[PDB]
Amino acid sequence: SHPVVTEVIIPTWSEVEVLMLAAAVESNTTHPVGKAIVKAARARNCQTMKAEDGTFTEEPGSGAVAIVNNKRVTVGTLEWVKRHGATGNSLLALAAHSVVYIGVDNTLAAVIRFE
Ligand SMILES: [N+]
């Protein structure tokens, strides 16, 4: 019903950094999963990372991407983040079992689980 971030799994970026990078991509989304990332990532005490103007790109049902502080940050299916250059990690998927995957440049950075 109401998606909430429950777990951030990391295989370098911390759990909170992954949330903040993904939220920068997802900042203006109306999609409930993206809004859940944004909510979880709010940090009133931090200099908010922002996507570069005009770089947000999305293919509905597959994922989104933007440049955040000079990094290509992807948020979406495993196929989406691999297509954008991340190398796979079978353990990350197994550790996770909705879910989204996070790529940062050529790195598969994280998986986020929602309940
Ligand atoms: N970061």
Author numbering: 606 to 616, 626 to 711, 717 to 734
What do the paper's sentences say?
P-type ATPases are transmembrane proteins that play a key role in the uphill transport of a wide range of cations across membranes using the energy provided by the hydrolysis of ATP, being crucial for the ion homeostasis in nearly all organisms and for heavy metal detoxification. HMA1 and HMA6 are found in the inner membrane of the chloroplast envelope and HMA8 in the thylakoid membrane. Here, we present two structures of the nucleotide binding domain of HMA6 and HMA8, the former at the highest resolution, obtained for any P-type ATPase structure. The overall structure of HMA6N-AA and HMA8N (respectively) exhibits a twisted, antiparallel β-sheet made of six strands being flanked by two pairs of short α-helices, one on the concave (α1 and α2) and one on the convex (α3 and α4) side of the sheet.
HMA6 represents the main route for copper into the chloroplast, also supplying the Cu/Zn superoxide dismutase, while HMA1 represents a second route for copper, crucial under high light. The initial construct (HMA6N) of the HMA6 N-domain was poorly expressed and required the addition of an N-terminal solubility enhancing tag, which lead to a 15-fold increase in expression. Modifications of the construct and the buffer remained unsuccessful and therefore the construct sequence was analysed using the Surface-Entropy-Reduction prediction (SERp) server for patches of surface residues, which, once mutated, could potentially promote local stability, and the three highest scoring mutants were tested for expression and crystallisation. One of them, the double mutant EE709AA, dubbed construct HMA6N-AA, led, together with a change of the buffer, to an initial crystal hit. A reduction of the protein concentration to 4 mg.mL-1 occasionally led to crystals with a different, more wedge like shape and a different space group (P22121), not showing any more the inter-grown clusters seen initially. These crystals diffracted up to 1.5 Å resolution and contained only two molecules in the AU. Glu709A, in the partially disordered helix α4, points to the solvent and the glutamate of the wild type sequence, when modelled in the structure, clashes with the side chain of Leu705 of the symmetry related chain A*. On the other hand, the side chain of Glu710 points towards the centre of the domain and would clash with Val730 of β6. Several crystal contacts are present between the chains in two axis, while these mutations allowed for a crystal contact in the third axis, between α4 and α4'. An interesting observation in the case of HMA6 is the presence of glutamate 672, not commonly found at this position, pointing to the nucleotide binding cavity and guiding the position of the conserved H645.
